[PDB]
Structure formats: C-alpha cells, structure tokens
Design brief:
By secondary structure, this protein is α+β, with helices and mostly antiparallel strands. The protein has a single domain, classed as 3-Layer(aba) Sandwich (Aminopeptidase). 22% of the residues lie in helices and 29% in strands. The protein is built from nine helices and 20 strands. It has a 15-stranded mixed beta sheet that branches. Strands 3-13-14 form a three-stranded antiparallel beta sheet, covered by helices on one side. Strand 11 and strand 12 form a beta hairpin. Helix 6 crosses helix 7. The protein binds 2-oxopentadecyl-CoA (NHW), ligand U53, chloride ion and magnesium ion. The site of ligand U53 has 16 residues, from strand 3, strand 8, strand 17 and strand 18.
Length: 385
C-alpha cells in the first residue's frame, strides 16, 4: 500500500530499521507556541464535539457509536462491545484531559458519527521515560468509511496533545501501518467450550467430540495460591512495588504512579478484576484481567461473548504457569466464556501447557514521533485496552 497519510507523519517508513544506539524523536525541539490553534477542517455538515465521558448521556452516545461501528474480527463473527462503565474507567485516568475525548457530529441529525481519544501516561521505551499520549477508540461510522475522516481525527488529536507539550504517543492496531515496534499474536483459552463451538468460534472433530472438548478444558475449582483475593485500597502501595519492580525488565512499559495503580487496578465489577496474595503484609503475587464483551453478530441464541483479557500478572511465590491457571479459574468464577492473552511479557511460556489456542490476528504496537529498534513481543511490558 502507498500510506499516503502516514508518510507525511513523523513515523518510520516501511523499510526503516534502527539499531539499539538510536532511541529518540523523529522531530525534537518542538515548541508549544508554534502549535496550530485552529481546529482542523471537517467536511461541510460535520462539527467537532468535546464529549464529557463523565456525563451519562454523552458517554452513552460514545457507547452506541462503538457498539454499532467498532472493531470486528477478520471473520465478521464478533464486534467488540466495550461497556459504557468500561469507557468511563478507560478514559478518566489520573490527569486525563476532557478535551482529548473528541467526537464528530453530523449536524443535520445531531448524532455522533466519529470518535478518537487519548489519555496521558509516562512510557519507558528502551530505558528512556517519556510523557506520551495513549490513543484508543478511533471509530468512524460504517456509513462514512474511506472518506479520509480518520486522518482528520488523527491530526486534530495530535494538535490537542501537542498543546500540552506532549510530542509522542503510543497506540495499537490489528492493521499493519508504518511501522510496528513489536507485534504480538492473540491466544484464547476456552472456558465455556460448548458456547464457543455453538457460536462458530471453536471447532470439533472425530477425535475431539463435544464431550472430549468439555473434558479437555475442564478446570479444578481450587486456587494454586489459596489466599488470592480481590484487591482493596490497602493493597495499592504493595501492588505499585510488585508490578513496578517487575515491569522494569521490559523494553516498553508504562511507569505507573501510586494514583495510577489505584485507578487501573482497584476492582470494578464487569470492568477490571485484580486479585492479590498478601503474605506478611507484603503483596507477593497479583492477577488482573479486564472485561471486553463482543456482540455475536446475527446469533439468535447468544447475543454476547463474555471475554476476559489478561492485563498484568506477576508471581514471586508460585510458577507463572500456576499463576495463570489461577487467572483462568478466577475468570471462570466470574462467568467469563473465554480468557484471552497476548504473547507479551511471560505469557507465551504458558500457552501450550494451559491449552490456549493461537488466534488469527496479531496486535501491532506503535509509537508516534519516536525512532528506535523493534523487538520481539516478550519484551513488551504494556497492555493497552
Ligand atoms: C504526539 C501525539 C500523536 C497523537 C496521534 C498518534 C497516532 C494515533 C493513530 C490512531 C490510533 C488508533 C488506535 C486505536 O483506536 C485502536 S485500533 C482500532 C481502530 N478502530 C477500528 O478499527 C474501528 C472500525 N474501523 C473504523 O472505524 C475505520 O475503519 C477507521 C476509523 C479505523 C479508519 O477509517 P476509514 O474510513 O477506514 O479510513 P479513512 O478515513 O479513509 O482513513 C484512511 C487512512 O487511515 C489509516 N488508518 C486506518 N486504520 C487505522 C488505525 N487503526 N490506526 C491508524 N490509522 C489507520 C489508513 O492506513 C489510511 O492512511 P494511509 O492512506 O496513510 O494508509
Ligand atoms: C473467542 C476469542 O476471542 C476473540 O477471538 C475475539 C473476540 N471478539 C473480537 C471482536 C473484534 C476483533 O477485532 C480484531 C477481534 C475479536 C477477537 S480476536 C482479537 C481480540 C482477542 N482476543
Ligand atoms: Cl494538514
Ligand atoms: Mg472516512
């Protein structure tokens, strides 16, 4: 492809490769005073809108746009269906900016037809910590595709981020764009196998009959780490220490403050689940996963796939395998149908033993305005929503 938008942006060209001695911006010495103060032009009949995600009705508009128009799998079986409470959690992290939650309305109907968002975070890339924006939830209504609206949303959010003297961003996508810093496949561990077969995701064969599949994926309802329990506010200092220490080994990770640990990990039912093991007043192990249902397109029995996605997991008292077997059990106890994980951090090491299957996509990780060496996905230490 020609990437005629992306080639105007400060990202690597498709054949660029940089060695470990290079870890810097494409464009440095940027000046906030020089940033354009005018909003980017939209086509006639469309207007910018600043969404207030803490207002239930604006949030509901974003929820409806994404439910009807967001990411589908390659096979068009599923569309992601982030909940409105999830959107509130994802977008109102510490020191978030309302003005980075950008909608576009079609004036004649007053309906939201496009969205993009970012939140601020400190990202460590090859041992250099940089303030970045983490961009997510880019969406154009399905009736307005291939009209070049996405570059207008990208340029408008870049402008507003640059007004805060932030000049780098991190983002992920299942599409290939110039140019990933790493690329991680999805893997899935079936929990409710019969439902996964019925909706057309999992398969059977003459060796693996339905009863044999159910037995294969059966799990014992006993934790390997007996005192794993939901995280509470008392555990924030300990989680900050256990996770922060663990993440320092990776080539790309977020540098969480204590306030960020409280926001990203304290549990919210049907949104984020974090469990900890406390021994002697120290947090020695943690499991976390978030809820991301998919709408099952056209299905008359099931409308929703409830899926848990692995977030951050660290063990110092058990094996990683035993930890992840406990995460699958915790997701099963919370009614999830499947447990999904990327091949980042230590995860790929347990996929075969814990009977995960390889999915069809991969998720590519990108930086904006940063040149550096790429690296294998076990050296990625960040999970975006
Ligand atoms: C310093 C601050 C920096 C801040 C900004 C950082 C960068 C943030 C970047 C955003 C990160 C978002 C991360 C995130 O949200 C997580 S990835 C999920 C993105 N959302 C979806 O896939 C939802 C369903 N699809 C859509 O809504 C549309 O297809 C979208 C809106 C995706 C494209 O709408 P469209 O109607 O299909 O297409 P046009 O308007 O005609 O636009 C065509 C151009 O858009 C480029 N494109 C397509 N998909 C992209 C994607 N996923 N990222 C980046 N760029 C993407 C494409 O390559 C082409 O450019 P090119 O001609 O050069 O090839
Ligand atoms: C059954 C296992 O879960 C998925 O395969 C799944 C479900 N819903 C989606 C909706 C949109 C979608 O867009 C790529 C993918 C999925 C996927 S695969 C990649 C995410 C994971 N795991
Ligand atoms: Cl322009
Ligand atoms: Mg378009």
């Amino acid at each position: 492809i020609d990437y005629k938008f992306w080639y105007t942006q400060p990202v690597p060209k498709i054949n660029d490769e940089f060695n470990e001695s290079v870890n810097e911006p494409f464009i440095s010495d940027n000046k906030v005073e020089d940033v354009r103060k005018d909003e980017y032009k939209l086509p006639p009949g469309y207007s910018w809108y600043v969404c207030d995600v803490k207002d239930e009705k604006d949030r509901s508009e974003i929820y409806t746009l994404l439910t009807d128009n967001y990411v589908e799998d390659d096979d068009n079986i599923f569309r992601f269906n982030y909940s409105a409470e999830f959107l509130l959690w994802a977008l109102t992290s510490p020191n978030y900016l309302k003005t980075w939650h950008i909608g576009v309305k079609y004036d004649a109907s007053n309906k939201l037809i496009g969205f993009i968002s970012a939140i601020p975070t400190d990202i460590c890339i090859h041992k250099r910590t940089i303030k970045m924006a983490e961009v997510n939830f880019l969406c154009v209504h399905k009736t307005l595709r291939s009209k070049r609206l996405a570059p207008v949303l990208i340029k408008e959010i870049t402008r507003r981020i640059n007004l805060e003297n932030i000049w780098q961003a991190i983002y992920t996508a299942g599409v290939y764009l110039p140019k990933p810093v790493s690329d991680a496949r999805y893997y899935h561990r079936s929990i409710n196998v019969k439902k996964l077969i019925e909706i057309g995701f999992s398969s059977l064969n003459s060796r693996l009959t339905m009863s044999r599949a159910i037995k294969l994926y059966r799990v014992e309802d006993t934790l390997n780490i007996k005192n794993m329990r939901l995280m509470k506010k008392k555990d924030v200092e300990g989680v900050h220490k256990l996770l922060g220490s663990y993440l320092e080994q990776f080539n790309l990770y977020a540098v969480f403050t204590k306030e960020e640990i409280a926001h990203w990990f304290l549990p919210i039912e049907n949104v984020i689940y974090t469990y900890v093991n406390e021994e002697n007043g120290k947090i020695k192990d943690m499991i976390s996963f978030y809820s991301l249902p998919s709408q099952i397109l056209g299905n008359d029995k099931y409308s929703t796939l409830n899926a848990a996605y692995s977030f951050y997991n660290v063990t110092t008292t058990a094996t990683f395998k035993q930890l992840m077997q406990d995460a699958i059990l915790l997701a099963k106890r919370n009614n999830f149908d499947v447990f999904n994980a990327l091949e980042v951090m230590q995860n790929k090491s347990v996929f075969e033993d814990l009977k995960f299957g390889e999915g069809d996509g991969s998720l590519k990780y990108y930086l904006y305005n940063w040149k550096c060496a790429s690296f294998a996905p076990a050296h990625v230490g960040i999970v975006l929503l």
